[PDB]
Write a protein that binds this ligand. Structure first.
Ligand SMILES: [Mg+2]
Ligand SMILES: [Mg+2]
Ligand SMILES: [Mg+2]
Ligand SMILES: [Mg+2]
Lengths: 67, 107, 50, 153, 60, 52
RNA sequence: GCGGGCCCGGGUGGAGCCGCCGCAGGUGCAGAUCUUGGUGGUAGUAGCAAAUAUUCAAACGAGAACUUUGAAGGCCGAAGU
C-alpha cells in the first residue's frame, strides 16, 4: 500500500507543478536524436572539412634567360 | 565615511593631449573613469548617460577642455559582487570654470 | 528562379525530402552499421549542378 | 583511468583530469610548469593574478618570438606572457580537484600540486584560403591535462 | 532580451521605417510577449510603443 | 592468375616536367582523393603487380 | 654465431603456431624530385591593416566590446549601404 500512496503523491505533485510552473510543452515529435547527433554531426563536419582540394599551377615570375 | 559626495572639475584638455581625432572622446571617458577610480577607491565606476552626452556634445574630435562632475560613492545595495561600493559620476552644468574648487557637497 | 517548371519543382521537392536526417531508432537495430546520414546536402556547397 | 606517475600515498591524494580541451598546448604547458609545486591557495592566487596581468607565466621552451616583460624577473627569466584561457582552464581543474579532495575527506588547505602533465590532443581541422587558389590547413591544437594533488604540510 | 521581431512588426503596422519605432525601454517584458500583430497594435493603443517624429530639416 | 584489367581500368596521364611531381601517371581531374595520385605502376597504391 | 640472424628471461596479448626432409614463389629496401598514410623544426612565427567611428545605461544571461532596448555621435547622401 505504501508504494500505491507514493504513486498517488507523485502524480498529484506532478500535476500541481505543471499547473503552477512549467510552460508550453510539446506533445511528442519523435524526440530529437540531437543528444548523440551532436557528436555525430561533429564527425560529419570533420568529414566536411576534409573535402578534396583541387591542384593548382604554382605561380613563379622568373626573370630572363641568357645569351 | 564612504557615502560622501563632492564636485570636481576635470581638465579633459591636458588628458586627451596628443590623441587621434577618432579616439579622443572615448579616451576622455576612459580618463574620467580613471579619475573616478583614483579619487574614490572603488573599481566599479558608473557613468551617467547625461555625462556621456555632455562629453559627446561637440563631436568626437572636439571635446570640451573643462567639465565639472559630481563624484558620488554608493553602497551597491543588492549586488553580491566583490566590489562592496561603487562610484557614480554625474554631469554638473556650469557657466564658467573660473575660481571653482573641489567643493564637497555635505549630506 | 520563381519561374520553374513542373519537372524541376518535383526534382527539388524530392531532394528536399531526402535531405532530412536519419531517425534515432534505426541505430537500435541489431544488424546496423549506420551512424549518420552521410548524404546531407547543404545549399552553400555542393550546389546541385542542374 | 590510468594516471602517469601514480601517487606515492593514494590514501591522502586526489586526482583531476580533462580530455580534448580546446586550449593551446604550449601556453597550457608553460602555465602548468609555472604552477607545479605550489600550494593550492597560492596556485589559485597566482592564476587570478595572471588573469589580471599582475604576474606573468615564464615561457622557457616555447619562447620563439615571445616578448620580454619585467614580470619575468621573479622567475629568473626574460620571456613571459599572461595566458588567460589556459589559466582559466586549469583553474577549473583546480576547483574540480578541490571538490574531489573535499568529497574524499582531505584537508583542502594542505594540498600541493605534486604532479601535473599536459599532453597533446587530436587536432581539429579547419581551412584557410591563400593566394593563387591555394588552400592550407588551419588546425587547432587542443591538449589533455591531468594532475595529482597531495596533502603535504 | 530580444525585440527585433516586435520592432519589425511595429514598423509594418505603423507603416514607418522602424527608425521611428520607439520600444519602451522600461516595460520590455510586455513588448516581448507580443509576437503576433493585432497585439502589437494593442501596445500602440496603450502608448507603450510610439512612432517618433521625423528629423527636422529646416528650410528657413 | 590476376585479372587482366587490374590497375589499367583508370585513365591516368603523367604530368610533364616543370612540376614538383615525380613523372608518374596520375588520375586526371575530379574533386576526389583519387585525383592526381598515381596509377599504372607497381610501386603505386592500387597500381598493377609487376609481371602479372 | 665473422656475418646474414637466432635461442632463452620478464611484461602485454588473447587463439592459433613451429622444427626437420622435399616442392613452389607476386620472397629480403635507404635512396628512384618513388606511391599511400602519419608526424616534426619553422612556430605560438607570418598574419587576422582596402572603403572616416564609436560611446553611455539597462535587460536576458553562469558567462557581454560584439545580442536586444533607450540615449548620444557618425556614415551611405535618391547613378544610395
Ligand atoms: Mg557559391
Ligand atoms: Mg580562385
Ligand atoms: Mg605576432
Ligand atoms: Mg563620402
Amino acid at each position: 500500500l505504501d508504494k500505491l500512496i507514493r504513486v498517488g503523491i507523485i502524480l498529484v505533485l506532478l500535476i500541481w507543478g505543471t499547473v503552477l510552473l512549467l510552460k508550453s510543452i510539446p506533445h511528442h515529435s519523435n524526440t530529437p536524436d540531437y543528444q548523440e547527433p551532436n557528436s555525430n554531426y561533429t564527425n560529419d563536419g570533420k568529414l566536411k572539412v576534409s573535402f578534396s582540394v583541387v591542384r593548382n599551377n604554382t605561380f613563379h615570375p622568373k626573370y630572363h634567360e641568357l645569351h | 565615511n564612504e557615502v560622501v559626495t563632492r564636485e570636481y572639475t576635470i581638465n579633459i584638455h591636458k588628458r586627451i593631449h596628443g590623441v587621434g581625432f577618432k579616439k579622443r572622446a572615448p579616451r576622455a571617458l576612459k580618463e574620467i573613469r580613471k579619475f573616478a577610480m583614483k579619487e574614490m577607491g572603488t573599481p566599479d565606476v558608473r557613468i551617467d548617460t547625461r555625462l556621456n552626452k555632455a562629453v559627446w556634445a561637440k563631436g568626437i574630435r572636439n571635446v570640451p577642455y573643462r567639465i565639472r562632475v559630481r563624484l558620488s560613492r554608493k553602497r551597491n545595495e543588492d549586488e553580491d559582487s566583490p566590489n562592496k561600493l561603487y562610484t557614480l559620476v554625474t554631469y554638473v552644468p556650469v557657466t564658467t570654470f573660473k575660481n571653482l574648487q573641489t567643493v564637497n557637497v555635505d549630506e | 528562379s520563381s519561374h520553374k517548371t513542373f519537372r524541376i519543382k518535383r526534382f527539388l521537392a524530392k531532394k528536399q525530402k531526402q535531405n532530412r536526417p536519419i531517425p534515432q531508432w534505426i541505430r537500435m537495430k541489431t544488424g546496423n552499421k549506420i551512424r549518420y546520414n552521410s548524404k546531407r546536402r547543404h545549399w552553400r556547397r555542393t550546389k546541385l549542378g542542374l | 583511468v590510468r594516471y602517469s606517475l601514480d601517487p606515492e600515498n593514494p590514501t591522502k591524494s586526489c586526482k583531476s583530469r580533462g580530455s580534448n580541451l580546446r586550449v593551446h598546448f604550449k601556453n597550457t604547458r608553460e602555465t602548468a610548469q609555472a604552477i607545479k609545486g605550489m600550494h593550492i591557495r597560492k596556485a589559485t592566487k597566482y592564476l587570478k593574478d595572471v588573469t589580471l596581468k599582475k604576474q606573468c607565466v615564464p615561457f622557457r621552451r616555447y619562447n620563439g618570438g615571445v616578448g620580454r616583460c619585467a614580470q619575468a624577473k621573479q622567475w629568473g627569466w626574460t620571456q613571459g606572457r599572461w595566458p588567460k584561457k589556459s589559466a582559466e582552464f586549469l583553474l577549473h581543474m583546480l576547483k574540480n580537484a578541490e571538490s574531489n579532495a573535499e568529497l574524499k575527506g582531505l584537508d583542502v588547505d594542505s594540498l600541493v600540486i605534486e604532479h601535473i602533465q599536459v599532453n597533446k590532443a587530436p587536432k581539429m581541422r579547419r581551412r584557410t584560403y591563400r593566394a593563387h587558389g591555394r588552400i592550407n590547413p588551419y588546425m587547432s591544437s587542443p591538449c589533455h591535462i591531468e594532475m595529482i594533488l597531495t596533502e603535504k604540510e | 532580451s530580444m525585440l527585433r521581431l516586435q520592432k519589425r512588426l511595429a514598423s509594418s503596422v505603423l507603416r514607418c521605417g522602424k527608425k521611428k519605432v520607439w520600444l519602451d525601454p522600461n516595460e520590455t517584458n510586455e513588448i516581448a510577449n507580443a509576437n503576433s500583430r493585432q497585439q502589437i497594435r494593442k501596445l500602440i493603443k496603450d502608448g507603450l510603443i510610439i512612432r517618433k517624429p521625423v528629423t527636422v530639416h529646416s528650410r528657413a | 592468375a590476376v585479372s587482366e584489367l587490374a590497375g589499367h581500368q583508370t585513365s591516368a596521364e603523367s604530368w610533364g616536367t616543370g612540376r614538383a611531381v615525380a613523372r608518374i601517371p596520375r588520375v586526371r581531374g575530379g574533386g576526389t582523393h583519387r585525383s592526381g595520385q598515381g596509377a599504372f605502376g607497381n610501386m603505386c597504391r592500387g597500381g598493377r603487380m609487376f609481371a602479372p
